[PDB]
Amino acid sequence: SRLIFEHQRRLTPPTTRKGTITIEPPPQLPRVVPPSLLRRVLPMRTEEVDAERADYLRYLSVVRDNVRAHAAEQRAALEWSHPEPEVLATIPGTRRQWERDPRDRDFLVLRAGRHDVPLDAALKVKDTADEIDLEPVAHSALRGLLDVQRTVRDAPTGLDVAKLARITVIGEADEARAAIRAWIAQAVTWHDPTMLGVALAAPDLESGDWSWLKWLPHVDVPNEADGVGPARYLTTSTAELRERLAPALALKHLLVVLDDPDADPDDIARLTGVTVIHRTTELPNREQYPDPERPILRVADGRIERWQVWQPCVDVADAMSAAEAAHIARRLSRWD
Amino acid sequence: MRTEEVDAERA
To answer: Which cysteines are joined by disulfide bonds (chain A)?
Structure first.
């Protein structure tokens, strides 16, 4: 039926030099004496302080070059590990489909879109003086460098679903399913069937919607035939999905999406690695200072906004269509 | 030492 995969080792992207870049502080605003014109009509004046300003701005150009190199390496790694959701149809044929080991620093981390990754380099000045007033053009340039270069521009972020354990999206009826489909295709493209599996609860499941999980080899269990599909975790009842999952849930990771806002959401947990996905109708208004794990996400036209007391967290969303993910799963089903 | 410099220092 299926073909065979051989787990060749992952290629290595050019890693980010995660260090501590230090900038020397600006000079100390030296008091120029007014030139005392009797020694000015004859031809520490302004020339020495201007030459020292030019020296500091040369040094600031050098450290701006270094910071831009760090940001280029970071965006190169993030574009190697999270491609735009059209490239990953060409992935599952070549030697880079089941590539993300749990030892690599990207594992069970999913692309939601492109926004401002905060530049994991340090950018720490060694300002040690006790509020000595700085030079008004050197310190202005350093303050202009530490605020627009410390945030990388629109770069592929990560919805790390190894440490959230509940992805309860809210929003529209099918526009939330776009983002769910997008990062669930991102999940099933990069990681092995034996390293994670995927499960579904849905009322109208085999109807041109979520039926594209028909071909996913991650919906399997070991040693059960069930006619055509191996296990077919996609069902219509969440409790029947749980008893379908009860030997599988007691580490092979899991990703359980639910389509019903009602019909006992989160009746599986509350587990110890199983992370569930849910779509709810409407928001909580006064959630009690929400945890770093289990967040709230509302899908706008192109924004995936988080809940923090609106902290949009994605500037442009990644929205996969239905037949696109159908083609991803159809190319994926050949290999195992 | 100019008096202008110590005046700026006083200020």
So the answer is: none
